[PDB]
Amino acid sequence: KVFGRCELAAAMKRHGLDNYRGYSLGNWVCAAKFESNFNTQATNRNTDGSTDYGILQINSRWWCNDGRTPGSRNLCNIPCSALLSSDITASVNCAKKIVSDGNGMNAWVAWRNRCKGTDVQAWIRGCRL
């Protein structure tokens, strides 16, 4: 599923990510924009041999099982394909786990390099929430 900006903001808000661990909704929308262009089916292989899945490009090294990442930890206890569904519930609940980990949203390199420190509220501009 390719989400619209305000559509995704609406879904993330309903799943409790606005101000989750102190991160405002626009931080989450901005991250999804640059990780996946709001496409739940996005996948990208990492140099270490792991793969990133879904709207927030959650990796198979620590977080989900994709059966081809040696050393995998599957901390969200899910197959990585669940992260690709049109229903973003699995992605959001896993992200909740990641952002609580210790390094916050710095866990997502695109957030750190492209959203962090910027006017992230713009990402929810115009949206009815």
| Interacting residue ranges for Cl ion, rule: CB under 5 A | 5
Q: Closest separation between CB of residue 38 and Cl ion, Å?
A: 8
Closest CB to Cl ion among residues 64, 120: 120
Measured from the Cβ of residue 50, the count of other Cβ atoms closer than 10 Å reads: 22
Is 52 one of the catalytic residues?
A: yes
Catalytic residue among 7, 52, 66, 87: 52
What are the distances in angstroms from CA 2 to CA 21, 39, 44, 92, 114?
26, 4, 16, 16, 21
Tabulate helix, strand, coil % of the chain (nearest 5): 40, 10, 45
**CB of 5 vs Cl ion, minimal distance in Å:** 5
* Nearer to Cl ion among residue 41 and residue 81 (C-beta): 41
Annotated active-site positions, please?
35, 52
